[PDB]
Amino acid sequence: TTCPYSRRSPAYCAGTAQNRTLSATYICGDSRLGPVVLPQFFPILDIYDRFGGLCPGAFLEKWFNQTGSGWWDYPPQNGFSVDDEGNIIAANLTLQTGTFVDRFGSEYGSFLAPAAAPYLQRSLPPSNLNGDAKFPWNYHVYSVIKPFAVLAGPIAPWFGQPGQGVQYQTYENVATLIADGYLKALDE
Amino acid sequence: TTCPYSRRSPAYCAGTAQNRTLSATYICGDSRLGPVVLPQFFPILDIYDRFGGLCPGAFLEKWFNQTGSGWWDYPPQNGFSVDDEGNIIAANLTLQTGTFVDRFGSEYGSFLAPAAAPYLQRSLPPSNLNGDAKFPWNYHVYSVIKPFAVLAGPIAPWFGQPGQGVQYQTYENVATLIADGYLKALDE
Numbered sequence: 001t002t003c004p005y006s007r008r009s010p011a012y013c014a015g016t017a018q019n020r021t022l023s024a025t026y027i028c029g030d031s032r033l034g035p036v037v038l039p040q041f042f043p044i045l046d047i048y049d050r051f052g053g054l055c056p057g058a059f060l061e062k063w064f065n066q067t068g069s070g071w072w073d074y075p076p077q078n079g080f081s082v083d084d085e086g087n088i089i090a091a092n093l094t095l096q097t098g099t100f101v102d103r104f105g106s107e108y109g110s111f112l113a114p115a116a117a118p119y120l121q122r123s124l125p126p127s128n129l130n131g132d133a134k135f136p137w138n139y140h141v142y143s144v145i146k147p148f149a150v151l152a153g154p155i156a157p158w159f160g161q162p163g164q165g166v167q168y169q170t171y172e173n174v175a176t177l178i179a180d181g182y183l184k185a186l187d188e
Numbered sequence: 189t190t191c192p193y194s195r196r197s198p199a200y201c202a203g204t205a206q207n208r209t210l211s212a213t214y215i216c217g218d219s220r221l222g223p224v225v226l227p228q229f230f231p232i233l234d235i236y237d238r239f240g241g242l243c244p245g246a247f248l249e250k251w252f253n254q255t256g257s258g259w260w261d262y263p264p265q266n267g268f269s270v271d272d273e274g275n276i277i278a279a280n281l282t283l284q285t286g287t288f289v290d291r292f293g294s295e296y297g298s299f300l301a302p303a304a305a306p307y308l309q310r311s312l313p314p315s316n317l318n319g320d321a322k323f324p325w326n327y328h329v330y331s332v333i334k335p336f337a338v339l340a341g342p343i344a345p346w347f348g349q350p351g352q353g354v355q356y357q358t359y360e361n362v363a364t365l366i367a368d369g370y371l372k373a374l375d376e
């Protein structure tokens with residue numbers, strides 16, 4: 001599956017914002033499609049396309065709004081892989097002390113990932129690559145100082161990404177896990 | 189956790205092969221510890237150490253022989269993550285057509301991974317980095333041409349690796365999945 005528009009085609013940005021002022025910053029001058037120059041990504045990877053092979057317009061048509069939300073349509077069941085009988089592939093897993101986990105988001109949320117898993121494995125939409133700082137303000141890395149249990153399981157493919165990394169849903173939010181002496185942030 | 193031996197220390201290769209003829213090729217001239225110059229790996233990654241922070245000798249003492257096998261001690265239950273109640277975190281998952289998977293090994297085996305998942309996530313021992321060719325003779329990449337089900341789940345940490353990628357145990361071997369029109373290899 002690939003976009004029929006060529007590399008020399010002017011119609012590649014069909015059905016997008018088509019904002020001349022931003023077109024050097026965001027793909028098609030459309031912030032939802034992410035930046036023209038990708039920052040960090042945590043050879044064969046060429047098999048994967050930022051839009052899963054669709055064209056920008058077709059990408060937005062498949063994944064954005066669709067319901068009335070005015071934002072992305074997220075996968076079912078917090079994005080865990082769903083087995084052939086309709087149940088998430090996930091169970092309570094105890095994180096050993098010294099484990100590195102990270103979160104793309106502020107300490108309010110309850111989701112973590114194995115540290116430095118690749119962006120493409122998290123099945124995040126492309127608007128989240130919109131970053132100028134080396135490392136985003138909300139990106140955090142932690143070590144497990146004190147064992148605790150999470151709902152752990154594979155990440156379903158979504159938003160044209162292959163997914164199939166692993167994610168941890170915590171039972172307290174990250175701020176609380178820091179406060180109670182489970183997660184210790186680290187700096188550079 | 190880090191190795192007390194320094195970067196200027198001559199004792200770093202304590203308890204290893206200590207083979208002067210190979211020491212430029214393998215760490216400590218010991219093929220089990222992998223190469224001195226790593227080929228492909230599919231910034232923050234610095235958090236991870238090829239030996240999980242142990243010293244070469246201590247690594248071999250923890251992970252190698254231990255039983256009489258004369259080889260690495262592998263994780264229980266084919267290396268799937270094991271939940272707090274002792275059951276693997278894994279279920280039957282149907283691979284959609286167009287999915288890229290790969291295998292580090294010949295078509296005889298029954299294990300696959302999401303294509304281009306990072307080495308450190310597979311929890312493979314370091315002897316498997318012993319490679320001169322750009323891509324090893326047995327490394328294969330495939331696309332799913334026809335849907336089928338696998339036992340899918342997270343990979344447990346092991347051999348000093350963080351693991352926590354995802355692996356697929358197939359029910360027929362890879363050669364059979366090729367023959368019956370499920371997997372299509374691709375070339376470069």
Ligand SMILES: *[C@@H]1O[C@H](CO)[C@@H](O[C@@H]2O[C@H](CO)[C@@H](O)[C@H](O)[C@H]2NC(C)=O)[C@H](O)[C@H]1NC(C)=O
Pocket residue numbers: 019020021022
């Ligand atoms: C292209 O994007 C730019 C940048 O956001 C938009 O420029 C703004 O347009 C609004 C219109 O109400 C003005 O009030 C702002 O002052 C503008 N800001 C800048 C930085 O230029 C622009 O509207 C977009 N183009 C189109 C056609 O919508």
Ligand SMILES: *[C@@H]1O[C@H](CO)[C@@H](O[C@@H]2O[C@H](CO)[C@@H](O)[C@H](O)[C@H]2NC(C)=O)[C@H](O)[C@H]1NC(C)=O
Pocket residue numbers: 207208209210
């Ligand atoms: C260091 O490794 C080399 C390379 O494998 C070993 O060299 C071989 O040694 C055997 C000893 O029986 C000879 O028969 C081979 O001809 C050697 N091959 C080469 C390419 O040199 C060597 O034995 C190792 N060193 C030690 C101390 O065991």
Ligand SMILES: *[C@@H]1O[C@H](CO)[C@@H](O)[C@H](O)[C@H]1NC(C)=O
Pocket residue numbers: 065066067068069070071
């Ligand atoms: C989404 O769909 C609704 C209803 O069709 C529409 O009013 C809205 O403008 C669309 N776009 C956004 C960004 O909400």
Ligand SMILES: *[C@@H]1O[C@H](CO)[C@@H](O)[C@H](O)[C@H]1NC(C)=O
Pocket residue numbers: 091092149171
């Ligand atoms: C997992 O842990 C939570 C919170 O401690 C508990 O309520 C739940 O029953 C446990 N079991 C499973 C299978 O999630």
Ligand SMILES: *[C@@H]1O[C@H](CO)[C@@H](O)[C@H](O)[C@H]1NC(C)=O
Pocket residue numbers: 253254255256257258259
């Ligand atoms: C492993 O252990 C056995 C029994 O202790 C010993 O005979 C053998 O030499 C050891 N090493 C290897 C590589 O088998």
Ligand SMILES: *[C@@H]1O[C@H](CO)[C@@H](O)[C@H](O)[C@H]1NC(C)=O
Pocket residue numbers: 279280337359
């Ligand atoms: C998975 O698939 C296999 C082979 O088709 C089947 O025997 C097994 O019962 C299925 N269910 C689970 C939970 O593995």
